[PDB]
Design a binder for this molecule. Structure first.
Ligand code: HEM
Ligand code: HEM
Ligand code: HEM
Ligand code: HEM
Lengths: 141, 145, 141, 145
């Protein structure tokens, strides 16, 4: 569960990300595929080479979904019900993978905004990403 | 776990350019802030009430240097790690009772510290190397458990 | 997140537990201390011997707290805010321990109500206990 | 991990009285029902749409006997387990790509199956023994990972 402070940090931090949300999403994925190759088995239909157009394109999709979760931080289950169906119901993604993606996302933010990535923000984002992961891995319909 | 020549390079390249002094307490501080239940083991260190108090704590920074140091000993023993961390494996197991799950957490926080220090230089290729190292150290300490 | 089906299973199952809720809570703890001895370090002030009066007494407290969570399955954060303070803020219990207690609780129910413990109920309870654990391990005030 | 004489007793006592036939598919069925994402690995088995369909599935029961069997091989090798499961460690790692976290889950579900079959007989003392065994098998398969 998120405290009011967490909600403030998440909103303030995601604002600073702004326009580069898509560029960061693409990088987080590129890092995940490299650091944890077993995650590559979930994208057989993808050309996972260096600067793939599919990967850079999926990074934007993932980023927009997160921007949407920040807006509806008080109603995540209802706002992400479509993605929950996809990842939990259809694809059946192992939850451990969400921890790997969340990690690589944090690492990416730390490299581009080291000044803004304070321990306090880090802690709030980690919790936020954990909530998102819980929703996408649950069958609640 | 086996390391390639390109991987031993990436790890040793950064170890050379880093602030061994200030970076230790930076990691320990983040561990305590992001994963609160870990403060239970450092209860004796004093004031751990806030992110500012934790990062400002003298004993956190001091112990931080020690942790960072034991990581340097790992780089020096990449081929045979298990034998090097047997003293610490026993200390954290039977003496402290820390779940192995927490070793992975410190490793992740470690990688995040390096990302803030090196920025763009901490590439995906470099990160992959460090993740592999961090995973090995974590399982070396879990010999008892 | 819990589906409407999960909520029904949890309510129906906890009803069958009924009066023995306290006897089951006591046993789940006895099993946990035995199977995972490291959890004993959280109760230094307790006499953890065979048929301890403290243990059997704490089992009732734990059981009542769970009965309360079932009633407020739609408002767990607000209904358990007191216990969240204790376990997360004051005691600082490592979350892995909640998984161990949840397991021993399920095992206890399986031994006393094998007929009622269908795979479907098992699945719903596991999720329910996971939600409770999330609330007790989070600092949200 | 080392086993005491009383512990080897508890494990072998129950292995003697159990339905090796029907109990295998019972465990695999529960794994697929309680932890849904695991159905991804058994996608080839057919209809896994409902608890009834999963438990009724012929290959789930068939593969269940195989899993239960490999557990019996563990009881016979309580001394040196790691060497016995090296064939399966490789199969699940490099061939299947199953996270080690899932091995612990099957172990837990295993313990819950025994609880429904033996009821009162499955005492806390007996459970402690089985948890220990289940933990050892899980870490034997995680050699590659
Ligand atoms: C922060 C958690 C995640 C978010 C916000 C997210 C977001 C998304 C979004 C928005 C889409 C495309 C939806 C559409 O356009 O219909 C998607 C599809 C997909 N996701 Fe995720 N996802 C997350 C985690 C994961 C993880 C951890 C995996 C597995 C490693 C995964 C695997 C997939 C796959 C295989 C697809 C289908 C790809 C395609 O479009 O062909 N996702 N996800
Ligand atoms: C990457 C894994 C870890 C490494 C390399 C490491 C290293 C060390 C070292 C070098 C010491 C000082 C020992 C001495 O002076 O003899 C130590 C002690 C200690 N460690 Fe760790 N540690 C690790 C993980 C953890 C974690 C995750 C926790 C708990 C969240 C923890 C808690 C402690 C405690 C409480 C002490 C004793 C402090 C004292 O003596 O005041 N360690 N550790
Ligand atoms: C299903 C999750 C849990 C529930 C519902 C629960 C419930 C409770 C309740 C109702 C109390 C006593 C509150 C009072 O009367 O003030 C309590 C106290 C306590 N709990 Fe838990 N608890 C849970 C898990 C745990 C776990 C996993 C641990 C650590 C292994 C733990 C450790 C403690 C301790 C040390 C106390 C204080 C004991 C005392 O009264 O002296 N709890 N908990
Ligand atoms: C207690 C840990 C486990 C044991 C003892 C075990 C044992 C076995 C055995 C004996 C086989 C058949 C191999 C053969 O016929 O050569 C097998 C294959 C397999 N296992 Fe496991 N397993 C375990 C855990 C898992 C888990 C948790 C998963 C995934 C959730 C899994 C998925 C599979 C799959 C997909 C196969 C291949 C099936 C096929 O050939 O059609 N195993 N396992």
């Amino acid at each position: 569960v998120l405290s009011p402070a967490d909600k403030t940090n998440v909103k303030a931090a995601w604002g600073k990300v702004g326009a580069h949300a898509g560029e960061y999403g693409a990088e987080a994925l590129e890092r995940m595929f490299l650091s944890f190759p077993t995650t590559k088995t979930y994208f057989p239909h993808f050309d996972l080479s260096h600067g793939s157009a599919q990967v850079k394109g999926h990074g934007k999709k993932v980023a927009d979904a997160l921007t949407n979760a920040v807006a509806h931080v008080d109603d995540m289950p209802n706002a992400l019900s479509a993605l929950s169906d996809l990842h939990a119901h259809k694809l059946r993604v192992d939850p451990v993978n969400f921890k790997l993606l969340s990690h690589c996302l944090l690492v990416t933010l730390a490299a581009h905004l080291p000044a803004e990535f304070t321990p306090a923000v880090h802690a709030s984002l980690d919790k936020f990403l954990a909530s998102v992961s819980t929703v996408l891995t649950s069958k609640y319909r | 776990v086996h390391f390639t020549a390109e991987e031993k390079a990436a790890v040793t390249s950064l170890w050379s350019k880093m602030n061994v002094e200030e970076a230790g307490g930076e990691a320990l501080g983040r561990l305590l802030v992001v994963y609160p239940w870990t403060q239970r083991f450092f209860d004796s260190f004093g004031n751990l009430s806030s992110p500012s108090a934790i990062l400002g704590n003298p004993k956190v920074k001091a112990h931080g240097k020690k942790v960072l140091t034991s990581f340097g000993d790992a780089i020096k023993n990449m081929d045979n790690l298990k034998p090097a961390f047997a003293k610490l494996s026993e200390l954290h197991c039977d003496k402290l009772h820390v779940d192995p799950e927490n070793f992975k957490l410190l490793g992740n926080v470690m990688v995040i510290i390096l990302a803030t220090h090196f920025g763009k230089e901490f590439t995906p290729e470099v990160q992959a190397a460090w993740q592999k190292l961090v995973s090995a150290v974590a399982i070396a300490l879990a010999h008892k458990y």
